[PDB]
Design a protein around this ligand. Sequence first.
Ligand SMILES: Cc1cn([C@H]2C[C@H](OP(=O)(O)O)[C@@H](COP(=O)(O)O)O2)c(=O)[nH]c1=O
Ligand SMILES: [Ca+2]
Length: 129
Amino acid sequence: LHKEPATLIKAIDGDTDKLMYKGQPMTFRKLLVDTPEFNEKYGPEASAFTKKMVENAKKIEVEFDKGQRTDKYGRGLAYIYADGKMVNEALVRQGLAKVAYVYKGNNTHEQLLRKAEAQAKKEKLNIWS
Ligand SMILES: Cc1cn([C@H]2C[C@H](OP(=O)(O)O)[C@@H](COP(=O)(O)O)O2)c(=O)[nH]c1=O
Ligand SMILES: [Ca+2]
């Protein structure tokens, strides 16, 4: 997989961000994760976590997997990176997202995230408390 540049247009919630990619605006949905919606427990905290990460980053990057790049809703499917740190992984490690939506052909980082989830659960963090 390769990292590609993107610029933050607007943080939306734990799972999504409006980004400029190849000079066009696009909602990006994080691969391999499911965060609670704002109205659910830890939803607000998830949104806040990701917002801070992407807003404070000097460099935002997107990494497509080997499979589908856009979902049924026109959203880009990618690993999102803030100053080299994957937001997808960080959410799971902090117990603010579960590993989810793992489809064949789009699961390069499955094990990495699952490892993070186990550590979050072991630490009884957030979703796991
Ligand atoms: C993460 C992800 C979600 N999606 C779709 C499946 C789910 O369909 P449904 O909308 O029919 O439930 C939905 C979940 O996204 P959200 O979790 O943002 O709602 O997005 C994919 O198709 N591929 C993916 O990799
Ligand atoms: Ca969600």
